[PDB]
Design a protein around this nucleic acid. Structure first.
Ligand SMILES: [Zn+2]
Lengths: 183, 53, 104, 53, 78, 62
RNA sequence: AGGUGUCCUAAGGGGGGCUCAUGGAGAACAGAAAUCUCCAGUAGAACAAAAGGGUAAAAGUCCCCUUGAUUUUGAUUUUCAGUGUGAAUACAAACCAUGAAAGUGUGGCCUAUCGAUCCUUUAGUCCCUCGAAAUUUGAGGCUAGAGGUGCCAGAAAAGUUACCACAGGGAUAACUGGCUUGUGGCGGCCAAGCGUUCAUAGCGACGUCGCUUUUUGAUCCUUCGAUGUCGGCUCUUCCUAUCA
RNA sequence: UUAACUGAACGUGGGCAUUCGAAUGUAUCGACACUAGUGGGCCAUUUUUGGUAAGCAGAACUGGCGAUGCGGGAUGAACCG
RNA sequence: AGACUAAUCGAACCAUCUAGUAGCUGGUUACCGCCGAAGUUUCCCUCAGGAUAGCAGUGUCGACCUUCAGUUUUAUGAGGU
RNA sequence: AGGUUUUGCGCGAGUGUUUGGGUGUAAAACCCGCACGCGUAAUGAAAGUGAACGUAGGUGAGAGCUUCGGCGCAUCAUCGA
C-alpha cells in the first residue's frame, strides 16, 4: 500500500489539433520544430493556440486592430491566430501590416487599398523567426449568445429560455410585487 | 416531467397524427409532368403568346 | 377595543401633504356587480348540461376578521385605509375608561 | 446567538451602530455575512496588537 | 338581532355580577394582589360604560365575556 | 412501516471530499450597505480629484 | 412538564416627582385582620398571558401633554435551496409629538399570536385603450389594502361486501423455529418467631441470590408464484424435578 | 461633518530589503460547461434516551461491511494482521 | 337458491376502438484499458414514488501564477458539561 | 418533429440554391432570382420614447513586446457616463 490521494491523473490541455486539415498539419510541424530549438517565448504561445477549437478563437475586427495601433505601436507587426473581419463603422483605415490565419474578402481588399500588406503564418516564421517587434491580440471570448444563459438563478440577472418574448411569456408572479413576490 | 434547465416544450402530437402524413417523393416526377403540359400547350397555340397582358 | 371618532395624521392630498384632521369610519364591502368579466364568464360556463363546473369552499376554520378603518380629510375630502389586527371589539366614539373610581 | 463570540471587520459606521463582516461555515462552503450591531455589544480586540507592536 | 343582543347583554351582566363576588369577598382577596385588581376594575370601567351605548351587539358582549374571564382567571388560578 | 428518522453519519466526509472552499479576499470591497448620505458626497469628491490631476499637465503642478 | 388561533385609545410615545413585598415598636371604639406615625428593608414585590432572561431618582407607581399604531421605496439577520410566508435590526428623504435642552419615538421590555395563483370589492392618479372619426354611460388596464384555504407551500367529496375480483408484499399480522424471562413453575442463603420447655425433628416473617422453557407476554429475523391450521385413535423412543 | 482646512474616505510626491519578517509539506492551483447512478441501509469502541431485558427501538464524533480477495479465530458479510 | 339463460352468470358469446393505462413483478446478447459512488438536506393527499442540493465522470481554458493545508507552535477572545 | 451544450467544416455583418423556374447521358448532376426566415436595438400593461463630457473613462492585477523609459490582449473586482 502507498496511501495516495491521486493516481494516474491526466493532463488538462490539448496536445494536438483535433482537425484533419492537411495544410494545418504542415503548419504544426513547422512550429513544433521552432519551439524546441528557439529561446523566444513568442513561438511557444503560437503553437498552443493552433490546437484550440473554434469557440476559443473568436474573430477580431479592423476596429480592434486600429485601437491598439496608438501610443507608439504604429511600426509593429500585428499577429492574430484567428480570422480577421472587416468593420463597417470604420470609415478611414490606417496603414498596417497584419499576419493572420485567414482574411475575409472585404478585409483583404481594404487593407491593401490603404497601402498595407497581408502576411501568412508561414511567411511570418520566415521573416521574424523569433517574433521580434510583434504584438499578439485576441477576440472577445465571452461575447457569445450561449454565455448569457450560464449560471441562471435567483438574483443573478441572467437570460431565460423562452420560446418567445412578450407580456404573456413569464413576467407575472415572481417578477413583480403586484403578484406575490419578486424573484 | 422536467428535470433540468430546459425550454418548456409544446409539441402538438397527441392526436392520431400518423394517419395523416404527406411525404413528397414525387417532387421530380411531378415536375416532368408540368413541363410536358406546357410544351404541349405551346404547340396548340402556334403563333400566339402563352400568357396574357 | 375602541378608537376615537377623529384623529390627525399625514394626508397624501395634492395640496395638504401634512398632518390634517380626519374623520374615522368603518369600511364595508359593496355589492357584487352583475356585469364584471368574472361573472359574465361564470354564467356561460354553467349553462347547458354538465352540472357544477367550479369548486365550492366548505372547510372554514377562521372565527374572526380583520377590521379596516376608512379615514377622510376635513379639507380635500381624501380618504385613506389603515388595517388593524384581528379583533372582536370595534367601536368609534366610545367613552374613555376611569382610574381609581372603583364602586360596586 | 450564532455570532456571540465571533470576531469580524467593520465595514460601515452610522449614528449609533456599526456594520461587521463575519464568515459563516455552512456545510461544504463558506458564506459572507453582514450584520448591524449596536455599540453596546461590540468591543475592540487585542488580536492584532502583538503584530502591530 | 334584538333577541341575540338581549341574550348576550344578560350573559355579560351575569358574568360581571359573578366576578364582583370574587373581587368582593375577603377570603380570596386576601391572597389576591392589588395590581391585578385595579386592572380588572379598570377594564370593568369601560365594561359598565359600553352598556349605556346602544350600538353594541352580541359579538361585543362575547368578547368582553372572554376578556374578563381570562383576566380574572389568572388572578384566581394563581 | 416505520423507518429511520434522520442521520448525519457521512456528511463530514462528503464535504471534505474536494475541499472546503473559502472565497478569495480582494483589494477593493464593494460599497453595498454604506449609508447613502456619505455615498452621495463621496461621488462628488472623486469627480473633482480627477479633473485636478488631469490639469497637472497644463496647470497647478502641486 | 407546559403553551398559542387572543388582549390593549392605552396596557402605545415624551417628561417630572416618589420606591416595593415583608418585619419591629406605638395610637379611643379597633379584635389575627379597618386608619395614622417612626425605624430597618438588593428586590425576596410589580411589569395583559406559558416559561426563561431583564429592570430601583426605573422598564414599577401616580400626575401633565399627545397619536411615530402615519407617507414613498431599497439593503440586512433567523428557518433556508441561502426560494416563499411569518417575525426582527440599522440608515436615507418628508411630515409631527414631547421636553428648558442634549435627546427619544416607524406599536406592546425581548423570545409565539398566522396565509399563494384565479375571482370579487374599496382607496389613489386625472393617467392609458375600446384598433374608420368624435361626445357622454358602461367595460377593460397600472400601484396599495380586505373577503381563505387549521390536511395551515393552499383537491370540491358518505357506507357495505360472509357473493366477490386484479397487481404486489415476508418492507406488515394469525402457526412452528430463534433471542429475552417481567409474569408462571422449581430450588437455595440469613434467622425474629411457632414448636409442652428448646431458632434449625418438621416449619420460617422482614430481606436476598439462582435455574428451567410443558404458562402467558414483549420483539418481527426466516416462509404470502402456499411448510395442510383443534381433538381423539394407533405405535416407537428419550428426559428425571421418583407415584409403585 | 466641525466655532474652525478641524475631521473623514479616495489621492500626488517621498522614505524603509544587506534579512519580504514562526515550523513542516506542496505525489497535485483557480474558473466554467454538460450529465449518470443514489435518496429501504447495517455493524463496532467511547458518550447516551425509553424498557426487567432482548440477535429490541432511537441519537453524537470517527472507523468498517455493502462495493473485497489474502494469512489467523476448526467453522462464521462486520474481529486481529 | 342470486337460481337458470348451449360444460360459461353478483350481468352470456363474437369482432373492432386496442399494441387500452400501471408510482407494481420478470427479462435485457463480444473483449481489453482508466476513474469510481449513494441511502443525507428542503418542499409535495408525500411515506414501495418525484423535483432540489450533495457525492461521480468527461470536455476544457487562465498561469505553470509560487498559491495553498481535516497539522503544530506563539499572541488574544467566547462557553457552563 | 422541436429544444439544448460540446467537436469538425464553409462563408462572415451578414447568412440559407431545391415552394418554384432553366437544363439533362433523366427520381442523379449543373445553373438562376423576387420574396421570406434568423441576426444587426432595447424598454413599458399601454399611448410612446430610443444609447459618445474624455484618444469609447479612472484605479489595482495581467501573457507578450520594448528604443529599457514604457505600451499593455483575454479575463476578474471596483468607482463613473
Ligand atoms: Zn387633505
Amino acid at each position: 500500500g502507498i496511501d495516495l490521494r491521486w493516481k494516474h491523473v491526466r493532463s488538462s490541455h490539448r496536445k494536438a489539433p483535433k482537425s484533419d486539415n492537411v495544410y494545418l498539419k504542415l503548419l504544426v510541424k513547422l512550429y513544433r520544430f521552432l519551439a524546441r530549438r528557439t529561446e523566444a517565448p513568442f513561438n511557444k504561445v503560437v503553437l498552443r493556440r493552433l490546437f484550440m477549437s473554434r469557440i476559443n478563437r473568436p474573430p477580431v475586427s479592423l476596429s480592434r486592430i486600429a485601437r491598439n495601433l496608438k501610443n507608439g505601436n504604429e511600426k509593429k507587426t500585428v499577429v492574430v491566430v484567428a480570422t480577421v473581419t472587416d468593420d463597417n463603422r470604420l470609415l478611414q483605415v490606417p496603414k498596417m501590416e497584419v499576419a493572420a490565419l485567414r482574411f475575409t474578402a472585404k478585409a483583404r481588399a481594404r487593407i491593401e487599398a490603404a497601402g498595407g500588406r497581408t502576411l501568412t503564418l508561414d511567411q511570418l516564421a520566415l521573416e521574424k523567426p523569433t517574433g521580434a517587434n510583434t504584438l499578439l491580440l485576441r477576440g472577445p471570448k465571452n461575447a457569445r449568445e450561449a454565455v448569457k444563459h450560464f449560471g441562471f438563478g435567483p438574483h443573478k440577472h441572467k437570460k431565460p429560455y423562452v420560446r418567445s418574448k412578450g407580456r404573456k411569456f413569464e413576467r407575472a408572479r415572481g417578477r413583480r410585487r403586484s403578484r406575490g413576490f419578486k424573484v | 416531467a422536467i428535470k433540468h434547465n430546459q425550454q418548456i416544450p409544446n409539441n402538438h402530437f397527441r392526436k392520431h397524427w400518423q394517419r395523416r402524413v404527406r411525404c413528397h417523393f414525387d417532387q421530380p416526377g411531378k415536375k416532368v409532368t408540368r413541363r410536358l403540359a406546357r410544351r404541349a400547350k405551346a404547340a396548340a397555340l402556334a403563333p400566339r403568346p402563352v400568357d396574357k397582358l | 377595543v375602541n378608537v376615537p371618532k377623529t384623529r390627525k395624521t399625514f394626508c397624501k392630498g395634492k395640496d395638504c401633504q401634512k398632518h390634517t384632521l380626519h374623520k374615522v369610519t368603518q369600511y364595508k364591502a359593496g355589492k357584487a356587480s352583475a356585469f364584471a368579466q368574472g361573472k359574465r364568464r361564470y354564467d356561460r360556463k354553467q349553462s347547458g348540461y354538465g352540472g357544477q363546473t367550479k369548486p365550492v369552499f366548505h372547510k372554514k376554520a377562521k372565527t374572526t376578521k380583520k377590521i379596516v378603518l376608512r379615514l377622510e380629510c376635513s379639507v380635500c375630502k381624501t380618504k385613506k385605509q389603515l388595517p388593524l389586527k384581528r379583533c372582536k371589539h370595534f367601536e368609534l366614539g366610545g367613552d374613555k375608561k376611569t382610574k381609581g373610581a372603583a364602586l360596586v | 446567538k450564532f455570532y456571540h463570540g465571533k470576531t469580524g471587520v467593520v465595514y460601515n459606521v452610522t449614528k449609533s451602530a456599526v456594520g461587521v463582516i463575519v464568515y459563516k461555515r455552512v456545510k461544504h462552503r463558506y458564506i459572507e455575512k453582514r450584520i448591524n450591531v449596536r455599540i453596546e455589544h461590540v468591543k475592540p480586540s487585542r488580536s492584532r496588537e502583538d503584530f502591530l507592536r | 338581532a334584538f333577541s341575540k343582543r338581549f341574550e348576550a347583554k344578560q350573559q355579560l351582566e351575569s358574568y360581571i355580577s359573578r366576578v364582583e363576588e370574587i373581587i368582593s369577598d375577603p377570603t380570596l382577596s386576601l391572597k389576591l394582589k392589588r395590581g391585578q385588581k385595579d386592572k380588572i376594575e379598570q377594564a370593568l370601567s369601560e365594561a359598565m360604560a359600553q352598556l349605556e351605548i346602544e350600538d353594541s351587539t352580541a359579538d361585543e358582549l362575547k368578547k368582553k365575556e372572554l376578556a374578563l374571564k381570562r383576566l380574572v382567571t389568572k388572578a384566581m388560578a394563581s | 412501516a416505520k423507518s429511520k428518522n434522520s442521520s448525519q453519519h457521512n456528511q463530514s466526509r462528503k464535504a471534505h471530499r474536494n475541499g472546503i472552499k473559502k472565497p478569495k479576499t480582494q483589494r477593493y470591497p464593494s460599497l453595498k450597505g454604506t449609508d447613502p448620505k456619505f455615498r452621495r458626497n463621496h461621488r462628488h469628491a472623486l469627480h473633482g480629484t480627477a479633473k485636478a490631476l488631469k490639469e497637472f499637465k497644463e496647470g497647478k503642478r502641486e
